[PDB]
Amino acid sequence: QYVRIKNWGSGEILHDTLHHKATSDFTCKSKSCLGSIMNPKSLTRGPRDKPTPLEELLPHAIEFINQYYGSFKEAKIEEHLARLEAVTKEIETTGTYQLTLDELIFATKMAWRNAPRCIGRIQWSNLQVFDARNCSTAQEMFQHICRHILYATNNGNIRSAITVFPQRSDGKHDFRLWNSQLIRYAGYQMPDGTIRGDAATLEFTQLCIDLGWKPRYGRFDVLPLVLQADGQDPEVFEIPPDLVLEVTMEHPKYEWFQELGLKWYALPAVANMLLEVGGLEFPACPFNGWYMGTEIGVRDFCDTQRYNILEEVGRRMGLETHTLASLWKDRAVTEINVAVLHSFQKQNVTIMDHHTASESFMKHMQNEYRARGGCPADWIWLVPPVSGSITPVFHQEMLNYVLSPFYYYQIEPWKTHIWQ
Amino acid sequence: QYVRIKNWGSGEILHDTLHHKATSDFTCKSKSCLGSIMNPKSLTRGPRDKPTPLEELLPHAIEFINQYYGSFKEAKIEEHLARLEAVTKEIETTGTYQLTLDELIFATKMAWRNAPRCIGRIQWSNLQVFDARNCSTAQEMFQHICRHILYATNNGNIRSAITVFPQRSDGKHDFRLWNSQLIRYAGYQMPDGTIRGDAATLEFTQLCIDLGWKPRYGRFDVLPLVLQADGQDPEVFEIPPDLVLEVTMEHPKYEWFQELGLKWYALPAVANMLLEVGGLEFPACPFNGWYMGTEIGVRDFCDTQRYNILEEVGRRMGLETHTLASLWKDRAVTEINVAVLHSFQKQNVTIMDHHTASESFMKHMQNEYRARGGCPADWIWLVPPVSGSITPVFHQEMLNYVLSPFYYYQIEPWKTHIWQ
Numbered sequence: 001q002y003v004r005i006k007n008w009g010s011g012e013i014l015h016d017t018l019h020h021k022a023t024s025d026f027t028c029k030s031k032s033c034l035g036s037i038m039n040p041k042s043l044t045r046g047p048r049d050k051p052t053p054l055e056e057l058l059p060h061a062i063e064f065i066n067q068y069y070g071s072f073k074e075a076k077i078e079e080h081l082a083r084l085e086a087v088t089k090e091i092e093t094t095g096t097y098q099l100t101l102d103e104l105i106f107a108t109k110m111a112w113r114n115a116p117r118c119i120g121r122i123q124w125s126n127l128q129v130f131d132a133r134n135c136s137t138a139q140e141m142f143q144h145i146c147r148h149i150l151y152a153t154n155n156g157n158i159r160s161a162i163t164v165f166p167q168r169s170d171g172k173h174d175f176r177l178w179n180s181q182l183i184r185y186a187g188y189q190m191p192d193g194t195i196r197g198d199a200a201t202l203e204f205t206q207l208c209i210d211l212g213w214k215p216r217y218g219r220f221d222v223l224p225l226v227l228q229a230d231g232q233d234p235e236v237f238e239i240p241p242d243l244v245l246e247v248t249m250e251h252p253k254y255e256w257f258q259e260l261g262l263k264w265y266a267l268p269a270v271a272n273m274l275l276e277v278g279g280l281e282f283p284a285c286p287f288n289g290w291y292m293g294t295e296i297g298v299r300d301f302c303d304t305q306r307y308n309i310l311e312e313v314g315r316r317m318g319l320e321t322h323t324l325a326s327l328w329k330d331r332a333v334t335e336i337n338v339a340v341l342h343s344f345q346k347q348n349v350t351i352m353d354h355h356t357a358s359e360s361f362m363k364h365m366q367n368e369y370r371a372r373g374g375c376p377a378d379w380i381w382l383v384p385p386v387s388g389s390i391t392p393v394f395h396q397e398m399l400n401y402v403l404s405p406f407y408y409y410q411i412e413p414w415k416t417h418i419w420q
Numbered sequence: 421q422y423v424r425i426k427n428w429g430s431g432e433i434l435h436d437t438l439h440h441k442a443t444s445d446f447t448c449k450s451k452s453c454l455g456s457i458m459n460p461k462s463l464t465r466g467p468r469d470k471p472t473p474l475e476e477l478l479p480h481a482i483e484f485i486n487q488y489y490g491s492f493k494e495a496k497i498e499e500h501l502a503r504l505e506a507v508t509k510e511i512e513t514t515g516t517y518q519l520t521l522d523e524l525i526f527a528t529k530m531a532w533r534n535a536p537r538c539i540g541r542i543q544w545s546n547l548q549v550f551d552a553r554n555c556s557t558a559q560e561m562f563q564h565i566c567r568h569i570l571y572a573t574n575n576g577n578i579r580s581a582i583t584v585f586p587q588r589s590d591g592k593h594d595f596r597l598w599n600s601q602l603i604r605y606a607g608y609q610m611p612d613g614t615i616r617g618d619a620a621t622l623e624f625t626q627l628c629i630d631l632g633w634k635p636r637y638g639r640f641d642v643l644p645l646v647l648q649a650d651g652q653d654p655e656v657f658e659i660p661p662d663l664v665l666e667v668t669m670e671h672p673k674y675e676w677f678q679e680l681g682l683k684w685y686a687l688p689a690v691a692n693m694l695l696e697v698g699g700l701e702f703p704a705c706p707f708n709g710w711y712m713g714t715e716i717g718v719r720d721f722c723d724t725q726r727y728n729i730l731e732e733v734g735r736r737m738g739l740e741t742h743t744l745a746s747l748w749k750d751r752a753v754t755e756i757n758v759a760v761l762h763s764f765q766k767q768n769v770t771i772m773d774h775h776t777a778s779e780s781f782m783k784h785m786q787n788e789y790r791a792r793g794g795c796p797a798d799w800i801w802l803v804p805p806v807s808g809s810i811t812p813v814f815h816q817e818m819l820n821y822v823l824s825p826f827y828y829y830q831i832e833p834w835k836t837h838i839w840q
């Protein structure tokens with residue numbers, strides 16, 4: 001009937017009905033839970049060689065139209081009926097169909113609403129949609145991407161936005177951004193055995209090199225857009241520095257902090273995901289909301305596989321660096337987080353601390369259960385990388401499932417690409 | 421064939437073969453992940469009215485004996501064969517069977533090894549086993565429990581231990597400890613609308629009252645053992661104060677910290693779980709290892725549903741208590757954690773910080789994959805309530821599954837008890 005969910009903090013109880021509408025199989029099995037897996041197939045939508053089977057497309061298309069029309073307060077029945085007819089007619093005449101701008105907007109918001117790994121979902125109804133469904137060249141993609149970066153940025157006062165490129169036709173003409181995110185730093189395997197910049201973008205930095213990119217050998221070298229249009233070989237495009245807004249890090253107390261020469265871009269823009277809606281798939285639809293301090297302060301700066309600044313941030317604080325039990329890492333990371341927050345707040349760049357975000361998400365959950373009887377949620381991703389139980393989301397039991405529309409991962413393009 | 425697992429910190433990859441031996445269905449479904457659920461049925465072993473069906477018992481029994489005998493370096497084949505025969509003969513003659521002390525020891529260690537929610541598992545081969553399988557009265561249980569508390573405590577130098585009471589016969593003669601843990605503080609719904617002590621033990625404190633316990637109305641009132649033997653009504657037994665070792669909290673800097681009048685018992689002893697092994701079940705088998713600072717500092721002291729000391733610990737630190745973004749909670753909790761650590765370390769009471777534990781568990785995982793091709797792990801429980809990504813376990817993908825022997829939860833006794 002429904003799954004009983006409890007919040008161990010408030011004692012409140014919710015009943016999940018929404019999970020019943022879940023698509024197909026998920027990450028876990030009958031005798032195992034694999035909720036810990038980063039990139040499971042259930043969260044991935046791969047390549048294709050042929051168009052989508054009509055028998056599969058049609059039902060999916062009708063389901064979406066019924067969802068879309070059952071959305072407004074006083075349902076426009078005559079239009080609802082008319083759209084169902086027009087979409088079917090389009091499918092049997094063209095082998096596919098086009099969404100109305102309105103439906104796209106609904107789709108991108110609902111897919112965001114359906115992102116189980118996003119804590120910012122209370123903002124789901126505030127999203128700018130850029131319709132680049134008529135794009136055809138790499139140069140045009142690059143232009144659309146620039147307009148996105150410029151709009152989203154809004155000179156620090158971040159605005160959530162997404163740009164949709166042409167939907168996958170037969171799978172051999174896919175528009176793809178080879179970048180992880182719109183703005184990302186390079187990583188170099190320097191001569192002295194070390195690694196400069198962002199070690200996460202190592203393999204991709206080389207790819208950019210092999211494609212003729214000019215390695216600036218540094219720590220914060222904004223990588224170039226690697227765009228593939230209409231299935232052609234990817235073209236390298238350098239991002240105009242004027243567009244890339246960064247925030248130099250400075251502690252409100254430790255004046256020695258800026259001597260680290262640390263900064264980070266103000267724009268969190270996922271670039272390699274796929275939007276699935278009503279049987280259609282858009283393999284190129286970069287999007288962004290705003291940052292949560294912990295992503296930068298904790299993950300980007302402190303991960304062993306990323307910048308790895310903990311060792312020296314502890315030293316410069318005078319902490320017992322060679323004694324784990326002293327909890328130095330705990331003291332450092334906290335200061336790096338207030339620095340990140342402080343910095344953004346000083347330079348007027350929108351940001352959100354993990355505590356405030358968790359509280360708003362909790363309110364979002366409540367609004368959601370009351371509204372549609374559920375909220376797909378991935379606890380492992382929703383709970384901040386620090387201050388776990390200090391956060392309200394930690395004490396909230398949740399169900400994780402894939403609905404539709406949805407935002408899927410994709411197989412890295414260089415692994416499946418055709419080199420002509 | 422096997423599930424591929426990766427550690428995003430080191431880049432290392434492991435192959436899980438162990439999950440194939442998993443018992444039955446787990447928490448999650450085919451289209452949903454419920455790994456976030458605290459007390460799912462898959463982790464619970466309920467009551468019974470009749471003995472265990474022979475057809476079920478026998479295979480389980482044989483599987484365990486084969487596991488046990490396939491354990492020593494140079495297998496004692498003749499004895500292996502002989503035990504298989506003797507156990508079958510015992511099952512068909514008595515309707516059940518008894519484990520040898522050796523098998524019990526192996527069973528309790530393996531079950532611990534199989535606890536997916538325990539980060540301390542590198543210590544799995546160091547465990548004292550108290551055989552109280554011949555116990556028959558509530559008074560005898562109480563005595564055994566006292567000997568356990570005394571041994572485990574060892575005057576601060578904690579030793580892992582478990583005491584096994586009589587196995588479930590027909591299910592109407594169960595030995596059960598109604599307490600959550602051996603040592604636990606009372607919670608009172610005081611006159612002025614507040615709540616004193618440990619709010620988690622509220623409903624149970626009243627139960628103790630209804631049974632004639634003398635409410636001492638305080639904050640750290642060690643609750644009484646509520647023991648049910650041979651299926652009879654539970655008898656109240658007050659724990660001898662001399663046995664209950666506590667640690668008064670004091671910060672190595674903030675001398676005003678002890679003015680809070682804070683302390684906590686040094687003995688983490690789970691009292692209400694059930695041991696399942698070779699088809700048998702022991703519904704009474706309290707156990708303990710040692711504490712991880714975060715359990716006390718973060719959960720016990722800082723949870724909204726527990727002590728809830730954050731508000732004033734922040735105040736006394738001078739932090740911006742009415743501004744979430746200031747990250748005060750982060751600064752406070754860290755100090756409470758070093759206090760807890762410091763205190764235990766000063767009073768010579770064994771304890772472990774979350775960073776050191778995570779590193780040892782990681783080593784345990786490695787030893788385990790190489791040894792038996794896997795390690796059941798619940799990421800959601802294994803990752804500390806603070807410092808998530810600062811910890812190595814956060815970056816380690818893991819599989820969660822139920823093996824055998826195992827430690828199961830049970831339905832709270834007062835909900836199913838027969839009152840004669």
Ligand code: HEM
Pocket residue numbers: 108112115117118119120121123127160161162270287288289290291292295352357407
């Ligand atoms: C309004 C501000 C928003 C905030 C603060 C926010 C915050 C976050 C955070 C903390 C994550 C985790 C990132 C990581 O750990 O790598 C995340 C993930 C995600 N967010 Fe949001 N988000 C916001 C807006 C959006 C928007 C506009 C969309 C899409 C329309 C979105 C889609 C997603 C998706 C699909 C993921 C998963 C990414 C992945 O799996 O790698 N978010 N978001």
Ligand code: HEM
Pocket residue numbers: 528532535537538539540541543547580581582690707708709710711712715772777827
């Ligand atoms: C040697 C020191 C040990 C340490 C530091 C350790 C630590 C921990 C921690 C942090 C938890 C989580 C507790 C909570 O969040 O409520 C836990 C859970 C658990 N541990 Fe260990 N442990 C140790 C020894 C043992 C032993 C001796 C056993 C059993 C023989 C054991 C069995 C378990 C089980 C089954 C759980 C799950 C409890 C539950 O689900 O509520 N541990 N342990």
Ligand SMILES: C[C@H](O)[C@H](O)[C@H]1CNC2=NC(N)=NC(=O)C2=N1
Pocket residue numbers: 036037038380381382428814815816817818
């Ligand atoms: C192994 C484990 O799945 C990864 O380390 C996780 C855990 N949870 C996470 N949560 C979030 N928000 N981002 C992550 O990258 C992330 N990675």
Ligand SMILES: C[C@H](O)[C@H](O)[C@H]1CNC2=NC(N)=NC(=O)C2=N1
Pocket residue numbers: 008394395396397398456457458800801802
């Ligand atoms: C809702 C969620 O399952 C609970 O808040 C969790 C999460 N992880 C946890 N981890 C540990 N170690 N102990 C817990 O009680 C705990 N509870």
Ligand SMILES: N=C(NO)NCCC[C@H](N)C(=O)O
Pocket residue numbers: 120268269270288289290291292295296299300
């Ligand atoms: N807040 C968002 N989206 O709105 N984050 C998207 C992923 C960004 C990534 N975690 C980073 O730190 O770069």
Ligand SMILES: N=C(NO)NCCC[C@H](N)C(=O)O
Pocket residue numbers: 540688689690708709710711712715716719720
């Ligand atoms: N470390 C252990 N076991 O060895 N903990 C068991 C649970 C104790 C519980 N988390 C508490 O803080 O009281």
Ligand SMILES: [Zn+2]
Pocket residue numbers: 028032033034035448452453454455
């Ligand atoms: Zn699962």
